[PDB]
Every structure is written in structure tokens, then in C-alpha cells.
Scaffold this active site. Structure first.
Site, PDB file in Angstrom:
ATOM      1  CD  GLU A  11      -4.295 -25.520  -2.550  1.00 19.12           C
ATOM      2  OE1 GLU A  11      -3.685 -25.052  -2.500  1.00 19.12           O
ATOM      3  OE2 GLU A  11      -4.072 -27.163  -1.828  1.00 19.12           O
ATOM      4  CG  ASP A  20       2.622 -24.063   2.492  1.00 15.43           C
ATOM      5  OD1 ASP A  20       2.581 -23.514   3.733  1.00 15.43           O
ATOM      6  OD2 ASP A  20       2.026 -25.151   2.222  1.00 15.43           O
ATOM      7  CG  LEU A  32       5.459 -29.354  -0.165  1.00 18.95           C
ATOM      8  CD1 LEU A  32       5.630 -27.549   0.939  1.00 18.95           C
ATOM      9  CD2 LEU A  32       5.362 -30.167   0.772  1.00 18.95           C
ATOM     10  CG  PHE A 104      -4.024 -31.175  -4.080  1.00 15.37           C
ATOM     11  CD1 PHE A 104      -3.629 -30.197  -3.913  1.00 15.37           C
ATOM     12  CD2 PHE A 104      -3.916 -31.626  -5.390  1.00 15.37           C
ATOM     13  CE1 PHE A 104      -3.390 -28.918  -3.977  1.00 15.37           C
ATOM     14  CE2 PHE A 104      -2.972 -30.967  -6.396  1.00 15.37           C
ATOM     15  CZ  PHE A 104      -2.803 -29.289  -5.446  1.00 15.37           C
ATOM     16  CB  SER A 117     -15.004 -37.724   9.057  1.00 13.37           C
ATOM     17  OG  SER A 117     -14.056 -37.049   9.932  1.00 13.37           O
ATOM     18  CG  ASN A 132     -16.081 -37.147  13.078  1.00 13.48           C
ATOM     19  OD1 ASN A 132     -14.366 -37.046  12.541  1.00 13.48           O
ATOM     20  ND2 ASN A 132     -16.208 -37.139  14.044  1.00 13.48           N
TER      21      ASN A 132
END
EC number: 3.2.1.17
Length: 168
Positions: A11, A20, A32, A104, A117, A132
Site C-alpha cells: 500500500e 487509490d 480508504l 484488507f 478459490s 483460479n
């Protein structure tokens, strides 16, 4: 390496409000603020989160405090989720960190949606899961980050992170 170091690499850290990858207002370590197109709205949410009139700038400690809350919240989201928890409980320490990373990034709901998955991971079918996982908007939109997380699920090691930015 650990989850904090890992997400700090993925990040980055910015002390001023920024957009972002999706064009949403964010600050700190991927925190965010809002999906609203208004910078004002964003600044309001920031002041509310920080507890002071920031004018869109925060200090490093403030960024780190939001980051700790955010990691905490992701873990808690996992443990509270009926689809996520059993996967998380089945995994080893390194792979647990890969799952936290995705939550996250995308939120509980988003990840909870990767049904096939999740099953594969639960079954320890690493290569299959990695294939996948790659068939997703997530991988196509942020491939280099996606590749790191997928390699981590594939190998169960920190090799994808052992050379980079943030720290490693």
C-alpha cells in the site's frame, strides 16, 4: 516479515490525501476515506477518523494508528465471517497473512465471494487455487500486487516480498 510489513509494501505510505488505484480518496497506508468524488467529503471523513481538523494532512503516527485499526478490523472480519473463518483456521501462518491482505484490500464481502478459490485453499490445492485466483478482476486490475499474494498462497513463503520497497 509479517502482515504489517507486507501490507506496508503493497500500500505504501502517503501523508496527504491521495487517490487509490480505483480513483478513490485514501490516506496513510491504504486507508480508504470515501468513495465519494468530493474532496470535501473526504476531508470530512478524515477529520472524523483522526479526531482533529486535519486539512487533509496527517502525521506518521496518525497514519500508523489508522493502519493498526485497519489490520485489526480485517482480522476480525475474517473471524466473524462463516465462509472465511474456516479457511483462515485451516491455513499456516504465512498463508493466513495472504488472506488478511486480500480482505484488507477488497473487504470481507469481496473475498467471501471467491468461493471456488476458498475451497481450494481449504483443501490445500495450492497450484489450483493460484490459477483460479488469477481469473479475477482483482488480478487483471492490480496484477503485480495480485501476483505477490498469489505466490504467497502458492508457496507458503515470503519470497515474493523479500526484495522490495516498504521494507522488503
Amino acid at each position: 516479515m509479517n502482515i504489517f510489513e507486507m501490507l506496508r509494501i503493497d500500500e505504501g505510505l502517503r501523508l496527504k490525501i491521495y487517490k487509490d488505484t480505483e480513483g478513490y480518496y485514501t490516506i496513510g497506508i491504504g486507508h480508504l476515506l470515501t468513495k465519494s468524488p468530493s474532496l470535501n467529503a473526504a476531508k470530512s471523513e478524515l477529520d472524523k477518523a483522526i479526531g482533529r481538523n486535519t486539512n487533509g494532512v496527517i502525521t506518521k503516527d496518525e497514519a500508523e494508528k489508522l493502519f493498526n485499526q485497519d489490520v485489526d478490523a480485517a482480522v476480525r472480519g475474517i473471524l466473524r465471517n462463516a465462509k472465511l473463518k474456516p479457511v483462515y483456521d485451516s491455513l499456516d501462518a504465512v498463508r493466513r497473512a495472504a488472506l488478511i491482505n486480500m480482505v484488507f484490500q477488497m473487504g470481507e464481502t469481496g473475498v467471501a465471494g471467491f468461493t471456488n478459490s476458498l475451497r481450494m485453499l481449504q483443501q490445500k490445492r495450492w497450484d489450483e487455487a493460484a490459477v483460479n485466483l488469477a481469473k479475477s478482476r482483482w488480478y487483471n486490475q492490480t496484477p503485480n500486487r495480485a501476483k505477490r499474494v498469489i505466490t504467497t498462497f502458492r508457496t507458503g513463503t515470503w519470497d515474493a516480498y523479500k526484495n522490495l520497497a516498504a521494507a522488503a
